[PDB]
């Protein structure tokens, strides 16, 4: 996270950690269900290991609080890691081996219902344990990104000359003026929006560059069906 203030405790309870292939984040729903970007498990570029950390906001205690195992892993079928420049359906659900007891530092996030949460002029939040402006992190970091007008986001792409894909299953958050923006290491978090009900309108999918620009967030509302049905415990 770049240009992000420190995160006090209770602010972001659901936030997870994924030292799977590389460092990254997630979100909590229900109690035994982790949400994270599909590419955290399957990068586009030796066998890996699935390690989920939860509960604290300072990295040290988060590592002194044990890595919960893995029961079920389900990536969305619309994901192709072969395609070097595609991220349609960079969404995934992770079932914890054993459920976690809920306290005011281990709460789960809600899901969006109306498309409205995907308008143009609302402030959401993205949290990650990842790279800061000129160094690495040991704490949780939160930012206040406004969702952008997507027509300009294809304008911004073609302005950079990019044969990437901006599927409408995605919205884009930020602005090239914005000093604050999502960075590498936060590539699984959630665009958290408040009604006081906090929901996870978006998943940190991808983008180009870290600061000063538009970020691509796989909008989840189109997928909420796949989430409720993959939570069949």
């Amino acid at each position: 996270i770049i240009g992000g203030q420190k995160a006090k405790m209770g602010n972001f309870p659901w936030q997870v950690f994924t030292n799977i292939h590389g460092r990254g984040g997630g979100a909590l729903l229900g109690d035994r269900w982790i949400l994270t970007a599909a590419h955290t498990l399957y990068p586009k570029e030796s066998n890996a290991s699935l390690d989920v950390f939860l509960g604290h906001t300072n990295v040290e205690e988060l590592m002194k609080l044990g890595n919960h195992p893995i029961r079920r892993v389900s990536v969305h079928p619309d994901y192709r890691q072969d395609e070097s420049y595609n991220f349609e359906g960079d969404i995934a659900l992770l079932e914890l081996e054993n459920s976690v007891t809920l306290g005011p530092n281990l709460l789960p996030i809600c899901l969006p219902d109306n498309d409205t949460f995907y308008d143009l002029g609302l402030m959401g939040y993205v949290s990650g344990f990842g790279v800061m402006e000129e160094k690495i992190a040991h704490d949780l970091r939160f930012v206040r990104l406004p969702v952008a007008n997507p027509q300009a986001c294809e304008n911004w792409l073609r302005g950079k000359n990019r044969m990437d894909v901006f599927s409408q299953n995605m919205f884009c958050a930020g602005h090239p003026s914005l000093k604050q923006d999502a960075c590498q290491g936060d590539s699984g978090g959630v665009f958290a929006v408040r009604d006081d009900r906090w929901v996870a309108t978006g998943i940190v999918s991808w983008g180009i560059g870290c600061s000063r620009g538009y970020g691509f967030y796989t909008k989840v509302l189109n997928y909420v069906d796949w989430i409720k049905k993959e939570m069949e415990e």
């Binding site: 030292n19 292939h21 590389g22 460092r23 990254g24 590419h39 990068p43 570029e45 991220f87 990842g130 790279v131 690495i136 040991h138 960075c183 590498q184 290491g185 590539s187 999918s205 991808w206 983008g207 180009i208 560059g209 870290c210």
Partner: peptide, 21 residues
């Protein structure tokens, strides 16, 4: 591990195409 883990954080990234890769 903090630096090494980060040097792989940047390796497995969606923003860094092949500038830091």
């Amino acid at each position: 591990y903090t630096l090494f883990s980060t040097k792989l954080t940047q390796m497995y990234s969606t923003r860094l195409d092949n500038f830091a890769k």
